[PDB]
């Protein structure tokens with residue numbers, strides 16, 4: 110038993126208040142206003158259409174809200190009254206909920222935790238309480254090795270960027286480490302740059318490297334290991 | 342006399358290290374135990390997984406929990422898996438732990454932060470619909486706020502993890518109850534508790 114996530118949009122709730130105070134007086138018998146609104150409020154307080162996790166991203170919410178608002182305005186602009194108005198309104202809410210269910214199911218299968226490795230922090234809205242907070246999408250400790258061979262005296266570019274990085278929240282810096290055979294490391298760069306460029310490479314630049322994309326949290330968001338071969 | 346037998350040891354359960362020792366690196370909520378841990382890095386990482394392979398027990402069964410609530414549960418896991426100060430509560434059922442006294446603040450904050458989040462049952466120890474490989478709510482079990490199914494903090498502490506924990510009336514720094522998490526800066530407040538209970542007194 111959960112609300113229709115769409116009321117987490119303020120313009121929606123205000124549009125419904127405006128429907129009550131501005132629309133109903135001129136378009137429905139006064140003796141029906143109270144009951145009509147109780148019925149609408151109930152339509153919005155339960156959303157039965159949906160493995161639904163009760164969450165949504167701002168994008169999905171917005172899409173839903175825009176849609177509902179377009180349809181609601183359609184009805185109010187048409188200036189429809191009485192039984193007609195009632196029937197159309199509730200049909201519309203119904204249709205809208207079904208439409209929205211579609212948007213949600215799509216979101217779950219495409220936009221929720223789209224990272225394929227590592228840890229993505231993504232903002233979601235919890236439908237039950239309209240509370241907006243950041244969720245940690247944990248896929249894998251690793252992101253796995255890159256084998257890289259660089260022609261001697263060309264430039265070595267190590268790319269730490271993944272598709273999902275730009276959208277993730279709470280990310281800090283890309284750190285690049287050289288991993289020596291004596292089990293020590295040296296931090297060689299630490300910055301907003303997602304790639305490391307080492308120009309005109311020699312044999313001395315071969316070996317192990319590691320990228321850490323840092324997090325506002327305690328642990329890194331992405332770890333990528335690179336193994337560099339220098340081709341003479 | 343003093344139970345040193347019972348100090349600085351790890352239970353013989355499937356994930357635990359056979360003996361405690363320091364770790365270079367532990368994941369997030371498990372970091373307070375770096376100094377000397379019963380968990381490997383892998384274990385500490387696995388504690389934060391949705392449907393953590395450790396227990397195949399889903400926290401999302403009524404939908405995704407608020408992050409604040411998820412945090413509490415994960416910390417509980419880190420504690421169970423990483424703490425070297427549990428000897429006095431070890432029992433064989435190959436060993437488990439029974440009635441570890443969690444300070445009242447630990448249980449109160451947990452309860453407080455999960456109030457908004459939703460579940461379907463008040464004894465998580467059994468009676469689930471298990472068909473997908475992971476637990477789901479059984480036929481007719483209503484998803485409602487935690488404060489409905491666990492009316493008190495005590496209920497939450499004790500019932501979620503099959504009496505591994507006891508909600509202590511004792512508050513923190515009493516010497517006589519453990520914290521399920523602590524700030525690593527402040528040093529481990531459970532060591533003395535462990536020592537105390539290992540003793541005859």
Ligand SMILES: *[C@@H]1O[C@H](CO)[C@@H](O)[C@H](O)[C@H]1NC(C)=O
Pocket residue numbers: 289290291293
């Ligand atoms: C480890 O090996 C590297 C590369 O050969 C060397 O530069 C470094 O000084 C060594 N580090 C230590 C701590 O011995």
Ligand SMILES: *[C@@H]1O[C@H](CO)[C@@H](O)[C@H](O)[C@H]1NC(C)=O
Pocket residue numbers: 394395396397474
């Ligand atoms: C969790 O699920 C896996 C994969 O299906 C299963 O083989 C394993 O026994 C389960 N782990 C535990 C600790 O029960």
Ligand SMILES: [Cl-]
Pocket residue numbers: 424425426529531532
């Ligand atoms: Cl401890």
